[PDB]
Coordinates of C-alpha atoms in Angstrom, one line a residue:
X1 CA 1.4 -7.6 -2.4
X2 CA 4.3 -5.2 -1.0
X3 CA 4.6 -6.5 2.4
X4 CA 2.8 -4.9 5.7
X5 CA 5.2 -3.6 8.1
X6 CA 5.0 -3.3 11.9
X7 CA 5.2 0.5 12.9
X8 CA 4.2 0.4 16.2
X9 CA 3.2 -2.2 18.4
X10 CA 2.8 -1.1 22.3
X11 CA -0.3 -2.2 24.5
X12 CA -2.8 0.3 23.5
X13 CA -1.1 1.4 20.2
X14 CA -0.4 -0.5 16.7
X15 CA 0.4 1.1 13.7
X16 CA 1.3 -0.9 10.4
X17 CA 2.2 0.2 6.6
X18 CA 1.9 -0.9 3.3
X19 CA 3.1 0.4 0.1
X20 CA 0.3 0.8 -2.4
X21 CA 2.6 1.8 -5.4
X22 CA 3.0 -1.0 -7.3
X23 CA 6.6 -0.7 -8.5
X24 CA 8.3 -0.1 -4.9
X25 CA 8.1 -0.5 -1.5
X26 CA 10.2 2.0 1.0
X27 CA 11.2 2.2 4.4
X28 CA 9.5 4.1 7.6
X29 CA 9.7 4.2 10.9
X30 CA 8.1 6.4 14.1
X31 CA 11.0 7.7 16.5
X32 CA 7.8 7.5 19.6
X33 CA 5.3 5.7 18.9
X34 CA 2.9 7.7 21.3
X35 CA 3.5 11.5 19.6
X36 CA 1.5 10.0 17.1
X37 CA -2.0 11.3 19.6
X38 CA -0.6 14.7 19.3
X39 CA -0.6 14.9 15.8
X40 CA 3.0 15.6 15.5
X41 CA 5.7 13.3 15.4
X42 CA 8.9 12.7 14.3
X43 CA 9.9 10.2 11.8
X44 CA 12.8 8.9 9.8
X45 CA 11.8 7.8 5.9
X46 CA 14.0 6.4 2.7
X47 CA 13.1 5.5 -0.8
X48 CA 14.1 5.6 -4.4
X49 CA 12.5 8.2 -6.6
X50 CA 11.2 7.1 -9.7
X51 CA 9.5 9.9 -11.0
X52 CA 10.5 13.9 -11.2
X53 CA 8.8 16.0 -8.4
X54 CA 9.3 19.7 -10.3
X55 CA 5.9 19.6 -8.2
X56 CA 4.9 17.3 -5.5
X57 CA 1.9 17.4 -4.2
X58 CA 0.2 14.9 -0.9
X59 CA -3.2 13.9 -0.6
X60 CA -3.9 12.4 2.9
X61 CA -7.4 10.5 3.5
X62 CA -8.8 9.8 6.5
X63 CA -10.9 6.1 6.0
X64 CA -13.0 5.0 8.6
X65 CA -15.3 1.8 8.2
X66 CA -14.4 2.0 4.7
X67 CA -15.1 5.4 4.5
X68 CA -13.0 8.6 3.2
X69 CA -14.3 11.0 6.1
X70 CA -11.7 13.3 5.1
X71 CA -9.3 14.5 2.6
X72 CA -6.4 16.8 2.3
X73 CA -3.9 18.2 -0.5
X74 CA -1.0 19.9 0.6
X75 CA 1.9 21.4 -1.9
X76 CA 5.5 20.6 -0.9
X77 CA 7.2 21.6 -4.2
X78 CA 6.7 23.4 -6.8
X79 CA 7.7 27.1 -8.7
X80 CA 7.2 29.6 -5.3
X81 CA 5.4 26.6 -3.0
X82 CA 8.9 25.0 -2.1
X83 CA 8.4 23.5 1.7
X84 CA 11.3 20.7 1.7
X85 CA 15.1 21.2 1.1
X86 CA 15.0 18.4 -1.2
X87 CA 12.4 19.6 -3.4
X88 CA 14.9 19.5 -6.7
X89 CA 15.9 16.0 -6.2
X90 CA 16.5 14.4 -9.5
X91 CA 14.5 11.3 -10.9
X92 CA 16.4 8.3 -9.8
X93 CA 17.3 9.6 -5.9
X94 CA 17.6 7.7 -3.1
X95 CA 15.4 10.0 -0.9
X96 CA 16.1 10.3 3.3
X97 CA 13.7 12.3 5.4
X98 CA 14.3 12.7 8.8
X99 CA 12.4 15.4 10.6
X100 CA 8.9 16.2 12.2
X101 CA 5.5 15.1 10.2
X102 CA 2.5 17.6 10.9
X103 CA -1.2 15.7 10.1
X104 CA -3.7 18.2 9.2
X105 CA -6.2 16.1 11.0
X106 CA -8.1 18.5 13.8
X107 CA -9.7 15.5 15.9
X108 CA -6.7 13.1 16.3
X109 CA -8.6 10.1 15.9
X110 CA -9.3 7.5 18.6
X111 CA -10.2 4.0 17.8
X112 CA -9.4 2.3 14.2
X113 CA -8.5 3.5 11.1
X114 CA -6.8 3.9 8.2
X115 CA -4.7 7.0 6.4
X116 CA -4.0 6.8 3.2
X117 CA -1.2 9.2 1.9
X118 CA -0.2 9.5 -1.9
X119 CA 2.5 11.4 -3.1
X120 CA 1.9 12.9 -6.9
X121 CA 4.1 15.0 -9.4
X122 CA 3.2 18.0 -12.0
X123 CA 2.4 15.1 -14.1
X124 CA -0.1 13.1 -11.6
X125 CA 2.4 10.3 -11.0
X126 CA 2.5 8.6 -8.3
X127 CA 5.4 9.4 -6.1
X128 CA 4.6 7.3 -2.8
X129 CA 1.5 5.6 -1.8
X130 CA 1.1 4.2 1.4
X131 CA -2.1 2.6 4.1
X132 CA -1.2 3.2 7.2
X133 CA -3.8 0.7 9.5
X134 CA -3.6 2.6 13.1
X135 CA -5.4 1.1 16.4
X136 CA -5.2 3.7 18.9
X137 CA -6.8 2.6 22.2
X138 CA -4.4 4.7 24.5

């Protein structure tokens, strides 16, 4: 129901988002579309926070014909596991992230497919959830 947004459209590339946490959408954008192959890339994010991250933890899935062919965790805050200077941001934030995005992902997938990427707190809240549909024919 949050609306799916145009990251990148180029001839051999398309990437789109949509939000999959049902009480906001946010905003996200790819600097260069292409760094995306080389599995860094920088990219400029915003939203509101509506939970505490004392922890915040990602889970990245790798979906493939409807498959989850792979899955990830990765700790960005928490007591001693701190990875982000805004780590500490209170409930209520308007968040900005600006900066480079590493994907755990050995083979850079070719072809199409989905990442999913959720966001969740000490509590198991959901922070950010987000599909991101790519088609990568380059």
């Amino acid at each position: 129901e949050w609306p799916t947004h145009t990251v990148c459209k180029e001839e051999n590339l398309e990437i789109y988002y949509k939000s999959c946490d049902p009480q906001q959408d946010f905003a996200f954008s790819i600097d260069r579309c292409s760094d995306v192959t080389t599995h860094t890339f920088d990219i400029r994010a915003a939203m509101v926070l509506r939970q505490s991250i004392k922890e915040l933890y990602a889970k990245v899935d790798l979906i493939i014909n409807g498959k989850t062919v792979l899955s990830y965790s990765e700790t960005l805050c928490g007591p001693g596991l701190s990875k982000l200077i805004f780590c500490g941001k209170k409930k209520g934030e308007h968040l900005y992230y600006e900066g480079p995005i590493t994907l755990g992902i050995k083979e850079i997938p070719q072809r199409d497919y989905t990442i999913t990427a959720r966001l969740t707190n000490e509590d198991r809240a959901t922070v950010a959830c987000a599909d991101f549909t790519v088609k990568n024919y380059l």
